[PDB]
User: Fold CRISPR-associated endonuclease Cas9/Csn1 from Streptococcus pyogenes serotype M1.
Amino acid sequence: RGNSRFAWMTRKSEETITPWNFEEVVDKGASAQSFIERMTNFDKNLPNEKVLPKHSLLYEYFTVY
DNA sequence: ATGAGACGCTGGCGATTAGCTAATCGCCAGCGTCTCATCTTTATGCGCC
Assistant:
């Protein structure tokens, strides 16, 4: 509940998360999203901008060209 | 019109009585796993201001 430097999970509500209301209190979408975005790097040329996935068709066209 | 001033075995034993770190070495050290993802980075391979 905002007291750990290792957490990223977002609470839809603000209750003590139990195995029955786990699906409702925890935003599984935003938790997985924040989980992966916190590990991916940023573009060295464009610092504040993120990076496209490895299977992007535009990115394959880029490396091919 | 007299009655104070002058003070010991200790030292050298035993024998209680009491009490304390230190030097040497040996032992022996919580550890087991998996999942999941995440990023890097390296070996080789390709380009001239």
The helical segments of chain A are 22-25, 28-37, 57-64. The two ends of chain A are 48 Å apart (CA to CA).
